[PDB]
Amino acid sequence: AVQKVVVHPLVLLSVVDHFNRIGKVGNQKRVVGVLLGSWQKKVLDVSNSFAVPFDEDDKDDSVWFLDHDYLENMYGMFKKVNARERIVGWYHTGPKLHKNDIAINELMKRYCPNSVLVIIDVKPKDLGLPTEAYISVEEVHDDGTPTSKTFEHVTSEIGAEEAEEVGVEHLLRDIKDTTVGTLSQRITNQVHGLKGLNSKLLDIRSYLEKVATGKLPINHQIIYQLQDVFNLLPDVSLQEFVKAFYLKTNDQMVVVYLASLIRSVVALHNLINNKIANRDAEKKEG
Amino acid sequence: CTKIINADSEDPKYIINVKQFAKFVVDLSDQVAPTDIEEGMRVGVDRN
Amino acid sequence: TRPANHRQLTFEEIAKSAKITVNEVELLVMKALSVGLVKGSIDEVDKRVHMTWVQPRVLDLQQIKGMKDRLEFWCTDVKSMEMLVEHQAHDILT
Amino acid sequence: AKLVRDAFALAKEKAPSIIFIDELDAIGTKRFAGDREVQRTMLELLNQLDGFQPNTQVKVIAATNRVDILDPALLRSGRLDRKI
Amino acid sequence: MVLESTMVCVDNSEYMRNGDFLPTRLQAQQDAVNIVCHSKTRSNPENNVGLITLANDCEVLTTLTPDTGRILSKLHTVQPKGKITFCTGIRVAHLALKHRQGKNHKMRIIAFVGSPVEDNEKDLVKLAKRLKKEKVNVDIINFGEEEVNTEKLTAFVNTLNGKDGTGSHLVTVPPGPSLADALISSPILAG
Amino acid sequence: EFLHAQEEVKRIQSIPLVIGQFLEAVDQNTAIVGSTTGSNYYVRILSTIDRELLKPNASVALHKHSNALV
Amino acid sequence: LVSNVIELLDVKCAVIKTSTRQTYFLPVIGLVDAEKLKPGDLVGVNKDSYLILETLPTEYDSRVKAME
Amino acid sequence: LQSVGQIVGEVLKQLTEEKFIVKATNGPRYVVGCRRQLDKSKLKPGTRVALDMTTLTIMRYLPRPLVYNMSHEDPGNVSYSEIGGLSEQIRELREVIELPLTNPELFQRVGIIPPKGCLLYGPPGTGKTLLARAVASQLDCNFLKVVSSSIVDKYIGESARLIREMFNYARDHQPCIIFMDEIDAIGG
Amino acid sequence: PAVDTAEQVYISSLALLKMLKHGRAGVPMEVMGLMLGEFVDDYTVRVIDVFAMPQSGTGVSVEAVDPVFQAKMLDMLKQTGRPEMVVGWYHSHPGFGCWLSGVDINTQQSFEALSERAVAVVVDPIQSVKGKVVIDAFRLINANMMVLGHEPRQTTSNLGHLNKPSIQALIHGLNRHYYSITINYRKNELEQKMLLNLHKKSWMEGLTLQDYSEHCKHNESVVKEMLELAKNYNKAVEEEDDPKRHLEEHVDVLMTSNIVQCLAAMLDTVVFK
Ligand SMILES: Nc1ncnc2c1ncn2[C@@H]1O[C@H](COP(=O)(O)OP(=O)(O)O)[C@@H](O)[C@H]1O
Numbered sequence A: 001a002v003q004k005v006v007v008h009p010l011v012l013l014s015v016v017d018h019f020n021r022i023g024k025v026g027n028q029k030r031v032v033g034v035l036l037g038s039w040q041k042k043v044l045d046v047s048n049s050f051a052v053p054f055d056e057d058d059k060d061d062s063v064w065f066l067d068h069d070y071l072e073n074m075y076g077m078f079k080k081v082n083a084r085e086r087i088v089g090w091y092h093t094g095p096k097l098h099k100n101d102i103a104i105n106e107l108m109k110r111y112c113p114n115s116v117l118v119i120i121d122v123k124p125k126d127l128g129l130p131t132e133a134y135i136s137v138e139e140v141h142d143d144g145t146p147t148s149k150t151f152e153h154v155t156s157e158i159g160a161e162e163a164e165e166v167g168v169e170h171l172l173r174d175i176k177d178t179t180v181g182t183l184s185q186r187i188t189n190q191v192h193g194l195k196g197l198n199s200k201l202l203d204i205r206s207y208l209e210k211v212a213t214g215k216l217p218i219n220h221q222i223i224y225q226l227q228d229v230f231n232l233l234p235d236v237s238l239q240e241f242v243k244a245f246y247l248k249t250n251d252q253m254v255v256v257y258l259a260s261l262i263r264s265v266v267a268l269h270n271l272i273n274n275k276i277a278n279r280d281a282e283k284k285e286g
Numbered sequence B: 001c002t003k004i005i006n007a008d009s010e011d012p013k014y015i016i017n018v019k020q021f022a023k024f025v026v027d028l029s030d031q032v033a034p035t036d037i038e039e040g041m042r043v044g045v046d047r048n
Numbered sequence C: 001t002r003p004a005n006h007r008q009l010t011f012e013e014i015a016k017s018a019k020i021t022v023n024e025v026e027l028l029v030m031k032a033l034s035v036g037l038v039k040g041s042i043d044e045v046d047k048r049v050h051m052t053w054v055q056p057r058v059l060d061l062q063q064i065k066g067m068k069d070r071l072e073f074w075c076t077d078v079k080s081m082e083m084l085v086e087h088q089a090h091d092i093l094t
Numbered sequence D: 001a002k003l004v005r006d007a008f009a010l011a012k013e014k015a016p017s018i019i020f021i022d023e024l025d026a027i028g029t030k031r032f033a034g035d036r037e038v039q040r041t042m043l044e045l046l047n048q049l050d051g052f053q054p055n056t057q058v059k060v061i062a063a064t065n066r067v068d069i070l071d072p073a074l075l076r077s078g079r080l081d082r083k084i
Numbered sequence E: 001m002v003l004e005s006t007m008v009c010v011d012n013s014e015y016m017r018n019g020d021f022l023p024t025r026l027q028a029q030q031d032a033v034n035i036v037c038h039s040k041t042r043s044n045p046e047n048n049v050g051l052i053t054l055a056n057d058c059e060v061l062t063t064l065t066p067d068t069g070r071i072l073s074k075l076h077t078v079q080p081k082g083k084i085t086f087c088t089g090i091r092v093a094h095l096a097l098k099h100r101q102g103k104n105h106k107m108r109i110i111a112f113v114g115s116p117v118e119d120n121e122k123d124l125v126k127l128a129k130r131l132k133k134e135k136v137n138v139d140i141i142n143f144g145e146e147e148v149n150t151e152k153l154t155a156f157v158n159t160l161n162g163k164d165g166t167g168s169h170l171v172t173v174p175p176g177p178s179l180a181d182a183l184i185s186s187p188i189l190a191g
Numbered sequence F: 001e002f003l004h005a006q007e008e009v010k011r012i013q014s015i016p017l018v019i020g021q022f023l024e025a026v027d028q029n030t031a032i033v034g035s036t037t038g039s040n041y042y043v044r045i046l047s048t049i050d051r052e053l054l055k056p057n058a059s060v061a062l063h064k065h066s067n068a069l070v
Numbered sequence G: 001l002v003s004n005v006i007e008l009l010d011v012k013c014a015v016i017k018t019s020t021r022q023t024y025f026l027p028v029i030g031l032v033d034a035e036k037l038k039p040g041d042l043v044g045v046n047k048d049s050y051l052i053l054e055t056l057p058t059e060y061d062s063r064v065k066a067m068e
Numbered sequence H: 001l002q003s004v005g006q007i008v009g010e011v012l013k014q015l016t017e018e019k020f021i022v023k024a025t026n027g028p029r030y031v032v033g034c035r036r037q038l039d040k041s042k043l044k045p046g047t048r049v050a051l052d053m054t055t056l057t058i059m060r061y062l063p064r065p066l067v068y069n070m071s072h073e074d075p076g077n078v079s080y081s082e083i084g085g086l087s088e089q090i091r092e093l094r095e096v097i098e099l100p101l102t103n104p105e106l107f108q109r110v111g112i113i114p115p116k117g118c119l120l121y122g123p124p125g126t127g128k129t130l131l132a133r134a135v136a137s138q139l140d141c142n143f144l145k146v147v148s149s150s151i152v153d154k155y156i157g158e159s160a161r162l163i164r165e166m167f168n169y170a171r172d173h174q175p176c177i178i179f180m181d182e183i184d185a186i187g188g
Numbered sequence I: 001p002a003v004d005t006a007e008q009v010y011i012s013s014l015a016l017l018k019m020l021k022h023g024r025a026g027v028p029m030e031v032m033g034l035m036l037g038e039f040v041d042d043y044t045v046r047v048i049d050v051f052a053m054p055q056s057g058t059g060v061s062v063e064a065v066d067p068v069f070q071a072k073m074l075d076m077l078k079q080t081g082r083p084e085m086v087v088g089w090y091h092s093h094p095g096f097g098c099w100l101s102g103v104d105i106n107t108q109q110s111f112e113a114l115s116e117r118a119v120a121v122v123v124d125p126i127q128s129v130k131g132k133v134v135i136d137a138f139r140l141i142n143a144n145m146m147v148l149g150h151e152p153r154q155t156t157s158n159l160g161h162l163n164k165p166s167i168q169a170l171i172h173g174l175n176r177h178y179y180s181i182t183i184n185y186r187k188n189e190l191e192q193k194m195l196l197n198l199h200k201k202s203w204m205e206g207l208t209l210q211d212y213s214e215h216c217k218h219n220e221s222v223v224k225e226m227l228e229l230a231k232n233y234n235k236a237v238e239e240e241d242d243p244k245r246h247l248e249e250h251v252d253v254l255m256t257s258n259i260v261q262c263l264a265a266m267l268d269t270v271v272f273k
């Protein structure tokens, strides 16, 4: 297993360019490329990637072609340029994985036993996390269920290398928000958090509706981890919690009041100084 | 020229000592002949 | 079966349900907590066992329907507060 | 120190080598910023003396007009010991 | 001398695990691909050949490369423990052929049918009609245990090219001790 | 833009930095500092550093590229 | 750039003292064999990457050679 | 080939949880930061580290002539059998030294600081250091006989740096068991 | 005719990131690579993509432009669907500044031999410090035109807004041999947002609460500083007939911290019940 997959900005920019390059003329679904990177104790660092010519057929969901020799000699070239980059997975721009992806993941496993495929939804721009890292697992499913391939999910995040960091910061240079935050951006962060929580709850509710209506089978497991979500509610309005909450709210409110008083006194002093200055100028004019 | 390496008398290599800068393993330019550059004498080297 | 707000359990209900003496419920909940299926606490002056859960279970169609209704209520509350926050903080938002 | 090490290495390369160190008062002066470099040279020489031990064919003779100036660490036991 | 791309389709199903031909069908088919690719490439050194397997999968172990050595390389250690899926084999063969590097090479498909084909008649006839509409030539040759002179296969090759076409052959092999000499007399010399 | 400029000002005094010896103040936002490289440089001073901490002997940290006291 | 290997540590890695009187570390030793190396060896390394390119035979200074 | 060497540096002082002061072996000192996956506990004032040559970040730490080139004078394998005709002297050395080595707790039992100055005065060349090496090998304790350098204290050339070398080089780094050279110089 | 000062190079975001990453990776050694794209017109140089090439011992020079690697990568990228033509070459000058040396001059005329409008791009990786990308584009002017009373490039417009160049280029003879080309990075809206995804905080960060035991200590500290500042402000105002700015900054910090923490607390209390 893999604890994490940190994706550099270079690979997402490269997959964006690859999808734009292919779909500009070849209107097609997911475009497949290979993701290189460096390992760690357990966390993968995806650093560079390339595109492999791939074709697919919507019929039989198995008529596809991802080149073998192309992958091999792109890696030859990349290793010659930089030998630290190892094949660590592959990517496709399709928002959803296809029935076909199992074969491509096995083909990648032939090049890397712990191969992890990263879905990068280039077309949509949304709440966040445009990368989803998935790993193939194989087990008897413990609790006596028929076995299948399945793609276990591994968490992903977007990190950056110093050169990539300065590159991207200079690349934006027009919408980058202040890192200090300030009240407006903290409030917008809070609103964004509320929106994200609402979206996640809506997705979970849709999944639960699908399960209840029978359109999806009851997982019988992990669903009770969602039940664990339901149990973890803090249960506010408890007397001790209410008293502590009021105590800390007043502790913050007194500091807010002191700062507001400080600011008001400073503003009054500034206004007195300005009135004195303008009267001094008016009387000195004569 | 501190020493003549003489790997195979075809790619001989030459260890030189740049006063106090460093010491290096270089080859002669095509202008001069290997027999004209004996061990121990002082020679001019390009800066690159 | 507790309504998740009054999670505290009285002694008499345990004694009458498991048909065991009121001096054995204490040791029974102790054993359950020790095994790793309960993460609550035990009181004695009121003898109300505080309850918290880390041991989930299997669901059912009716239970799933009810709990997704609860989740719908939760998401409706979240949406209502988000709407209130964006409406009140429109100018500061930027 | 590099000169001392290279001279001792050249003595090693030839099997029957005799090193002759004349005027040991120069580098064998007792320690007390050229003193630092002189100490480096003398300690490299001392290490070279401490190097060979299996009655190797390399043997060293030191000549000096002054013994008071000479560092007593040079005499020692595993170093120049035959005070002729 | 004709520019063409050869997209061979070999078999490694379990039905190749009985000594009907030679020591076993594996080496028979290996030498068969050897000689057919030899004929194609000494006929024209500017051509290129590749191989797809068909046992329960369809791998592209060798793409369309002029150097026959890679095809000979991946023809080895084929480990015949699979099942033939002819419906997707020819489809993936054409889908790899459309990746042709040269735009002047002509179509040519060779598939190694050693196992009976479990395909709908309508499916194979529509595959042949699609090949007609895409102008792809396919030659099917049969080995081992097989319903001799398959009606489905003969209809497939008949409607592969009708009304005085080039005549993509449906070649059958005589059971027992027999090499591809019959497979090179008629099919290899003229397609 | 002012917040961005302050962020850049903070980014100026970022790792790595070169230790030197503050030789002598010359005027406001200007001084002479003896770097550990072995050379003395006439450099500028960021307004952020208080002018009272610059003792004629206290060590200072300078920008690697421009050698300016940061 | 000729240098003297001060020591070789495991983690297959070597510490290099260049003739420019500069001491660097090398996680990998380069194009020579670590087994065929020992402290005090003279090795020609790259001038920029400071990676050992070749091993060099023992060299004697001109004064040392004239010392004989 | 793609690898690039790293400068060797010494950590003078720990500035913050992420800032260090490191001086190159033959270069200036820079304020740098640790790479990431390193133990800041290992990065103490006095440790040898490997700065990256471009960002100067501490990539890794390294284990650490000099004046101590004449300090050591290890006892060797000299044992009791080599020394002859010092039975009473050997017993005196045991009764004086073995208790501080073997049983330091008896001094706490009685409640007194261990005896430090034991003078084995006598003609040189009679086996004084031989006796010391013999008892050292009996307890297998590292006998660090003083060879002045890195242990000179009274030598009036330097006052406190020599004190620092005396203390730190022995006892702290090397466990115990000391001696002194110029055996009659400072005693007189 | 003569080129125009209005000519500019359009570097895609991916191309710029690739060049900066390669320059940092090859440090301290100098790297080089081709610059795929299309000239499109006279006044534009669209650098769609750049791919690195293996490093050779000769450094950035013509012998390090191995045609086997270049040709294979070009035809095979065009096989993937990237049929661009070489428009120039990028190379790294760590700690040197954006300028062309003599060897770069030889490489640039070798590049102009097959493509007249080739561009030599210089990047300083170490100097490309956070918030500052030191990148420049050059094209050689032969001595024949500029000696013969001819301006190296006509300024048909006001696009010569390019500020006074770094004096390092002046010492290294910028205008004597290679006219610099003004730069203009081309950024799409998709790549802009999906580069924004780098530092974007997660939704759980907005609703999270700072450590309450830490918030109290921060409040104590800043309020005590405000007390010292109030003493200084009283002394300054009384002795009048910079405590004010420091006091205002401390007030801003305190108010934003406490207000944000309180509002997060209320949102969490309502949302999770
Ligand atoms: N009891 C003994 N048995 C064997 N050899 C001895 C004995 N005493 C002295 N020696 C010899 O005499 C020398 C003693 O020198 P030592 O007393 O250590 O001088 P110093 O104490 O001034 O260093 C040694 O070389 C040793 O071989």
Ligand SMILES: [Zn+2]
Pocket: I060, I091, I092, I093, I100, I101, I103, I104
């Ligand atoms: Zn250059």
